[PDB]
C-alpha cells in the first residue's frame, strides 16, 4: 500500500497532537499508546517513534526508548530531535560516549541551539567526569 490516505494520516497527525496533549497531561503511557495508534495509521514517522521513545524516556523505559529512538532515525534519517531521543536513550543507559556522538551530531547541525548544546555539553562534561 502507498502512504495511507488523508483522514487516516491526519488522524495519525491527530494522535500526535493527542499524545502531545497526554504528555502535557503528564501521562506518557497514553502518549505512548496514542503514538502507537498513530503507527497503526501511518508507519514511517520519526515523530511518532521519537516521542514514543521520549515517553519511554520519561518512564525510564530506556530499553524501548533506545529501540524506538533508533527506529525513528530509520524512518526519518534526518530528524534532529530524533537523534536527540536516541542520544538521551544512550545517555540514560550510561553510554555517555555513545550519547555524546549523537548529541555531538545534533550540536553540529544547530550549534546555535542551546537546546542541542545543553545535552551535548552535559554529556561531554560527564565524559570528563570520567576523566
Amino acid at each position: 500500500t502507498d502512504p495511507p490516505a488523508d483522514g487516516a494520516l491526519k488522524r495519525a497527525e491527530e494522535l500526535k497532537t493527542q499524545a502531545n496533549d497526554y504528555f502535557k497531561a503528564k501521562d506518557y503511557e497514553n502518549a505512548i499508546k496514542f503514538y502507537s495508534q498513530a503507527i497503526e495509521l501511518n508507519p514511517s514517522n520519526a515523530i511518532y517513534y521519537g516521542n514514543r521513545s521520549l515517553a519511554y524516556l520519561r518512564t525510564e523505559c530506556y530499553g524501548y526508548a533506545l529501540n524506538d529512538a533508533t527506529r525513528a532515525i530509520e524512518l526519518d534519517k534526518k530528524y534532529i530531535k530524533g537523534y536527540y531521543r536516541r542520544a538521551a536513550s544512550n545517555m540514560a543507559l550510561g553510554k555517555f560516549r555513545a550519547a555524546l556522538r549523537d548529541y555531538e551530531t545534533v550540536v553540529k547541525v544547530k550549534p546555535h541551539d542551546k537546546d542541542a548544546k545543553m545535552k551535548y555539553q552535559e554529556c561531554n562534561k560527564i565524559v570528563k567526569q570520567k576523566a
Binding site: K16, N20, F23, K24, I47, G50, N51, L54, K81
Partner: peptide, 5 residues
C-alpha cells in the same frame, strides 16, 4: 512550549 514533536 508545546513543540514536543
Amino acid at each position: 512550549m508545546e513543540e514536543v514533536d
